[PDB]
Structures are given as C-alpha cells and as structure tokens.
C-alpha cells in the first residue's frame, strides 16, 4: 500500500519539515518575548 518505499521518501519528507515547522513556532513565539 501507500508508503511502501517509494512514498516512504515523501511521507517521511513531510515530518523531517513538519516536525521541524513545530521546532520554528516555538523558537518564532518566543524571540516575540525577547528580541
């Protein structure tokens, strides 16, 4: 089925950027408290 191998590499894309996104918010609403 979906990500079998193939897919993995865009699936798994999207956390290696999605996961990181998350990272981003926390350290962007943050310097919004000291910049």
Same mark, same amino acid.
């Given at each position: #089925? +979906?990500?079998? *191998? +193939? #897919?993995?590499?865009? !699936?798994?894309?999207?956390?290696? *950027?999605?996961?990181?996104? &998350?990272? &981003? !918010?926390?350290? #962007? *609403?943050? #310097? !919004?408290?000291?910049?």
């Amino acid at each position: #089925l +979906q990500r079998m *191998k +193939q #897919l993995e590499d865009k !699936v798994e894309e999207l956390l290696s *950027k999605n996961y990181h996104l &998350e990272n &981003e !918010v926390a350290r #962007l *609403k943050k #310097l !919004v408290g000291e910049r």
